[PDB]
Amino acid sequence: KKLINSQISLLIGKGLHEFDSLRDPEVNDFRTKMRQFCEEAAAHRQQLGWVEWLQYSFPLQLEPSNRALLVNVKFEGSEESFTFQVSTKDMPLALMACALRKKATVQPEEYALQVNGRHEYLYGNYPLCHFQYICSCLHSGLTPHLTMVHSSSILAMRDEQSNQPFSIELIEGRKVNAVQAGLFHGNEMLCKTDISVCDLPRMARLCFALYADCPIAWANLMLFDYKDQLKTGERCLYMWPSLLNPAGTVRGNPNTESAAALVIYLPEVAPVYFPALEKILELEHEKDLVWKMRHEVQEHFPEALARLLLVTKWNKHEDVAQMLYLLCSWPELPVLSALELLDFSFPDCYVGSFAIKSLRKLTDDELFQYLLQLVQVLKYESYLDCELTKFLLGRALANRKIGHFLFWHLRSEMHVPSVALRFGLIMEAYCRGSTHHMKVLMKQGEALSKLKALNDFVKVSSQKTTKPQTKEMMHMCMRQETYMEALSHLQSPLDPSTLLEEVCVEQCTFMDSKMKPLWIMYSSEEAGSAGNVGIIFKNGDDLRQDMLTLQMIQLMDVLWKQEGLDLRMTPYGCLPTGDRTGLIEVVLHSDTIANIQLTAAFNKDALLNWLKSKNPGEALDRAIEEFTLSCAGYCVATYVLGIGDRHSDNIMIRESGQLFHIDFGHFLGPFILTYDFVHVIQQGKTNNSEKFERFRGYCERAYTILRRHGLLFLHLFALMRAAGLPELSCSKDIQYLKDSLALGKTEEEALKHFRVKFNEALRES
Numbered sequence: 001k002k003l004i005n006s007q008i009s010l011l012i013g014k015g016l017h018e019f020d021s022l023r024d025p026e027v028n029d030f031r032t033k034m035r036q037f038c039e040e041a042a043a044h045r046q047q048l049g050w051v052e053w054l055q056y057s058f059p060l061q062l063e064p065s066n067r068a069l070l071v072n073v074k075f076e077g078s079e080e081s082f083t084f085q086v087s088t089k090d091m092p093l094a095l096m097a098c099a100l101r102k103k104a105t106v107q108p109e110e111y112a113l114q115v116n117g118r119h120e121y122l123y124g125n126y127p128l129c130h131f132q133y134i135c136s137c138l139h140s141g142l143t144p145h146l147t148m149v150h151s152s153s154i155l156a157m158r159d160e161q162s163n164q165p166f167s168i169e170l171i172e173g174r175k176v177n178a179v180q181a182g183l184f185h186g187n188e189m190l191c192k193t194d195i196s197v198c199d200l201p202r203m204a205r206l207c208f209a210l211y212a213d214c215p216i217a218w219a220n221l222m223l224f225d226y227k228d229q230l231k232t233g234e235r236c237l238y239m240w241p242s243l244l245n246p247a248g249t250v251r252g253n254p255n256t257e258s259a260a261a262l263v264i265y266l267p268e269v270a271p272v273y274f275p276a277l278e279k280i281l282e283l284e285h286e287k288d289l290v291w292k293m294r295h296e297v298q299e300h301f302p303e304a305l306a307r308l309l310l311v312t313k314w315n316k317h318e319d320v321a322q323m324l325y326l327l328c329s330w331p332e333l334p335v336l337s338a339l340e341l342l343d344f345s346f347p348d349c350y351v352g353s354f355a356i357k358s359l360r361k362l363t364d365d366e367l368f369q370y371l372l373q374l375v376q377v378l379k380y381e382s383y384l385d386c387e388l389t390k391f392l393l394g395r396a397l398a399n400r401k402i403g404h405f406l407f408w409h410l411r412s413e414m415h416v417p418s419v420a421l422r423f424g425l426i427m428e429a430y431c432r433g434s435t436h437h438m439k440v441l442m443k444q445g446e447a448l449s450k451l452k453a454l455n456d457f458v459k460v461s462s463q464k465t466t467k468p469q470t471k472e473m474m475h476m477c478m479r480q481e482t483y484m485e486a487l488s489h490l491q492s493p494l495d496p497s498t499l500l501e502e503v504c505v506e507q508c509t510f511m512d513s514k515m516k517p518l519w520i521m522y523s524s525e526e527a528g529s530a531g532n533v534g535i536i537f538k539n540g541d542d543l544r545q546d547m548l549t550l551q552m553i554q555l556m557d558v559l560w561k562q563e564g565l566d567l568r569m570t571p572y573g574c575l576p577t578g579d580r581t582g583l584i585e586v587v588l589h590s591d592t593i594a595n596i597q598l599t600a601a602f603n604k605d606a607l608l609n610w611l612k613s614k615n616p617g618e619a620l621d622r623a624i625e626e627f628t629l630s631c632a633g634y635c636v637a638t639y640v641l642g643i644g645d646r647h648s649d650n651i652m653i654r655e656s657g658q659l660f661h662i663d664f665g666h667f668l669g670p671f672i673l674t675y676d677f678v679h680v681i682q683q684g685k686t687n688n689s690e691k692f693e694r695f696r697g698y699c700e701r702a703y704t705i706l707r708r709h710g711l712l713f714l715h716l717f718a719l720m721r722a723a724g725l726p727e728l729s730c731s732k733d734i735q736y737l738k739d740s741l742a743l744g745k746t747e748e749e750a751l752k753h754f755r756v757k758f759n760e761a762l763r764e765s
């Protein structure tokens with residue numbers, strides 16, 4: 001009744017009074033409208049069925065021949081566990097019907113299979129092989145553990161989890177040192193840094209830059225307000241430190257004490273708004289030809305809308321109204337085309353609304369893949385109340401996994417003052433819709449706060465004393481009441497399906513490096529070996545570049561699995577949580593190349609003998625295949641993304657044989673093919689052509705599949721420019737993908753070019 005308001009403030013890292021203190025009507029209009037939208041989404045959520053509620057809380061973790069395996073099935077009420085044998089091609093209902101007959105001695109449509117000690121469920125018309133939990137148990141050799149949960153238990157859980165030419169007067173400034181004005185409609189100008197007042201578009205930006213050559217500060221603002229009315233008159237521009245930047249935020253600097261301010265005046269012409277859609281509908285040499293053929297583009301080339309929207313004159317109101325008439329009648333564009341329109345080059349709200357309309361067909365799995373890029377588009381946005389915010393919030397309240405990651409993508413960027421207001425207001429609105437999930441994320445917030453204090457304890461002690469004494473100091477600090485309660489019994493921020501319960505204090509350690517990252521181990525009695533999970537807590541380094549690289553490798557694996565090619569990739573979870581704060585998922589039963597190299601007689605034998613120890617007898621044959629597929633997959637991945645600084649310490653190998661990279665610090669500027677890995681692929685033989693030429697084929701096929709989806713990597717990386725990455729800021733960064741994948745060249749021309757690069761790495765081996 002009263003605690004909710006106080007709980008949001010602690011959770012989002014900013015007090016609710018701070019929004020009210022600004023006295024801005026736009027912020028107040030957002031808080032009132034979004035709350036009603038979020039509460040209506042929460043009202044429909046309670047009206048949903050028991051299976052529909054499972055689709056929200058526990059989304060199906062699905063995979064992107066008459067095998068049989070035993071399954072341990074138990075009930076909610078009793079501790080009785082009935083183990084029986086089933087088939088991999090069987091439906092979950094068949095497993096439920098078989099479990100029903102076991103309890104009869106000692107209807108299945110009323111049950112749902114819950115994964116023991118996990119926030120995951122098995123349901124729907126899909127064979128057992130299509131589930132992520134089943135396939136993971138098969139390679140580990142473990143038997144799946146499921147619990148029968150009746151419809152009444154899911155329904156009871158739902159009830160407990162409920163809620164004239166344009167001119168401006170340049171007055172004065174106040175800066176520190178020893179003013180260029182320009183009008184923009186996206187990435188390009190409207191006039192020279194010479195435009196009529198009636199010839200001004202709705203999404204027009206007035207950009208400023210203060211300099212002496214030495215750049216000092218910049219400031220951008222919208223000509224029209226949130227209520228479609230042109231701004232008048234006097235305005236104070238709180239400048240941001242630094243030629244002219246149109247991509248930057250249209251909101252002033254919050255530090256009104258130290259940052260520079262510029263006073264400007266907007267001359268009154270009448271209370272002139274912008275004409276509504278109803279009124280709009282009535283009204284080198286290649287660019288002119290494309291605009292001439294505009295009707296043929298709407299009828300024959302719908303995909304060419306992006307090229308048509310760049311050629312249209314935004315500085316003339318006649319061309320804008322003519323284009324908008326076609327846009328309202330324009331057919332629905334596919335996912336790939338809609339992602340291109342979200343870029344800063346297309347600022348118009350109607351273009352943005354058309355993109356959202358085309359993005360409505362996205363599945364919860366597809367939305368999760370591009371979620372990071374969609375959150376970045378919010379930075380490019382002009383106003384708080386927009387279609388992208390409504391779409392991201394509406395889908396976050398429809399799927400709890402989406403709502404989990406959306407929150408963390410907004411919470412991690414709260415320390416940045418340019419996005420602190422927007423991201424905080426979106427999180428506040430989401431909390432009004434999901435009251436129970438707000439409490440769930442609070443437990444994660446308490447755990448990360450304790451981890452920061454534990455990392456600070458380690459950072460100080462490691463300098464004062466040695467490594468074994470600092471480890472025991474960390475152990476004694478963890479054993480405390482406050483630490484044992486906050487760090488136990490919570491949903492993992494890296495994966496909401498994974499439950500972190502008991503923390504194994506003795507297994508917990510730290511790396512003796514510059515930032516001192518924490519190693520946190522867990523265990524669950526209900527889950528068993530599935531509950532044995534680890535988390536790496538890092539503080540001081542920016543993990544935004546590490547996550548993006550790991551998300552692209554995850555995307556590569558998804559695109560390869562779509563064409564029936566499983567290159568056994570290891571896409572472990574990486575997620576930033578705050579100011580240089582983040583988490584890394586531990587890939588258990590794996591070690592670095594350096595640790596294994598340090599019995600074997602030679603360096604080439606070190607990796608092979610380790611595989612012979614973990615996979616004995618005929619199990620070694622699978623480990624070589626697992627290594628060959630993973631090496632070929634990561635070889636293309638490290639070449640396309642351009643991952644440099646590669647040594648034995650940043651390359652890891654699983655006990656099953658799977659090879660994977662870690663520590664992605666530098667990207668986008670050949671691929672390493674050292675004989676140490678080649679020796680494993682060739683089964684230990686000095687000369688094995690039949691085993692090497694197969695590996696050569698896997699590298700060539702993986703490269704061609706990514707070339708076909710070449711535009712997808714180009715569209716997503718262009719949207720990530722808003723984040724402000726140090727290695728992904730200029731047009732030269734996106735050019736690396738155009739050079740590595742060779743988009744301009746044909747399928748055969750790029751494959752022949754790839755063969756030269758493949759032989760270059762083999763000659764250096």
Ligand SMILES: Cn1c(Cc2nc(N3CCOCC3)cc(=O)[nH]2)nc2ccccc21
Nearest residue numbers: 509510511517518519536585586587662663
């Ligand atoms: C070796 N070591 C590392 C190195 C390190 N390990 C990483 N992981 C990736 C997931 O499987 C486990 C290893 C990812 C990464 O970026 N850096 N971090 C540590 C943190 C605490 C203790 C030891 C640590």
